[PDB]
Amino acid sequence: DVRVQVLPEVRGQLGGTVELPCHLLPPVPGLYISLVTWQRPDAPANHQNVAAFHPKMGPSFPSPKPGSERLSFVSAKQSTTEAELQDATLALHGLTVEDEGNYTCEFATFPKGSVRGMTWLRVLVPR
Amino acid sequence: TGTIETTGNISAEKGGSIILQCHLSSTTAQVTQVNWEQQDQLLAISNADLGWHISPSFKDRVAPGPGLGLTLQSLTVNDTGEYFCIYHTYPDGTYTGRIFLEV
């Protein structure tokens, strides 16, 4: 019923800001998004969870790489009023060669369960 | 950051009952949701606010509890396989534990 819409590959220049789109579709009434988590499946155990968003608490960045300084949630908003976690688009400011890789966006929902989508980040090199 | 402890590689007899338990230690992260899953099958969900939810496919063979654990009732030889406890937490992220059951 519920699915994750993500781009298969996202290309971005070195140093520039890029967007990793993640959307939970279609909007189902009665379905509650308990958590949103961005993960790097290639990175080690202590560097898996790069970004997370809670409907009440808001955003958090557990991994120090890329960290809070280079990451941000584009449209995700917390409740103060109801929360909107449907749009899990992540922004990557100051792109480096280490950021090139796989990014899995996961939605912890009730009662449908867990739904995820994966995107490859292609860091373009100049000269 | 933190770690998940399991009941380990459990062994059971046909027709009986067994307990699948997981515990997240070495972190104070707010446990928003606990998912009891298999490779490509969802058994049960435990939400901190919305409560428990059991899949219709396991509604007559699974009991919720103890705590954030699962109770498998009337065990069949088909119940053999890997079981996963996925902990959705804030701010740490997503923790995963694996349990192998043999009937």
What's A41's DSSP letter?
A: S
CATH number of A94's domain = 2.60.40.10
* CA neighbours closer than 13 Å in the CB half-sphere of residue B4: 24
In the three-class reduction of DSSP (H, G, I as helix; E, B as strand; rest coil), residue A47 is classed as helix
The residue of chain A with its CA nearest to that of B46 is: A110
Residue A36 belongs to domain spanning: 1-127
**Among A23, A25, A89, A79, CA closest to A51:** A89
Q: How far apart are CA A53 and CA B86, in angstroms?
A: 17
Q: What's the CA gap between A90 and A61, in Å, rounded? A: 11
Q: Count of CB contacts below 8 A, A vs B?
A: 65
| Cβ pair B45:A54 closer than 8 A | no
Rounded to an integer, what distance in angstroms lies between the CA atom of residue A49 and that of residue B95?
Answer: 9
**How far, rounded to the nearest angstrom, does the alpha carbon of residue A36 sit from its chain's CA centroid?**
7
- Per CB-CB distance under 8 Å, the chain A contacts of B64 are none
Contact B90, A54 (CB under 8 A): yes
Contact: A54, B30; criterion CB under 8 Å: yes
The answer to whether A124 and A12 have CB atoms below 8 angstroms apart is yes
Whether residues A114 and B42 touch (CB distance < 8 A) is answered with: yes
Record: contact A113-B45, CB cut-off 8 A:
yes
* Window A:37-96, CB contacts with B under 8 Å: 37, 39, 46, 48-49, 52, 54, 57, 60, 62
Q: Hey, how many other C-beta atoms are within 10 angstroms of the C-beta on B54?
A: 19
Q: In what order do the strands lie in the sheet with A90-92?
A: A18-20, A90-92, A71-73
> Would you tell me which residues 37-66 of chain B have a C-beta closer than 8 angstroms to some C-beta of chain A?
37, 42, 45, 47-48, 50, 53
CATH assignment at residue B98:
2.60.40.10
Split into its structural domains, chain A has a count of 1
From residue B68, alpha-carbon distances to A22, A77, B49, B85 in Å are 29, 29, 13, 9
Chain A within 8 Å of B33 (Cβ-Cβ)?
yes
Chain A residues in contact with B50 (beta carbon < 8 A): 32, 34, 110-111
Distance CA(A102)–CA(A119), nearest Å, equals 6
Residues spanned by the domain of B16: 1-103
Nearest chain A residue to B41 by CA: give it.
A113
Domain count for chain B, please give it. 1
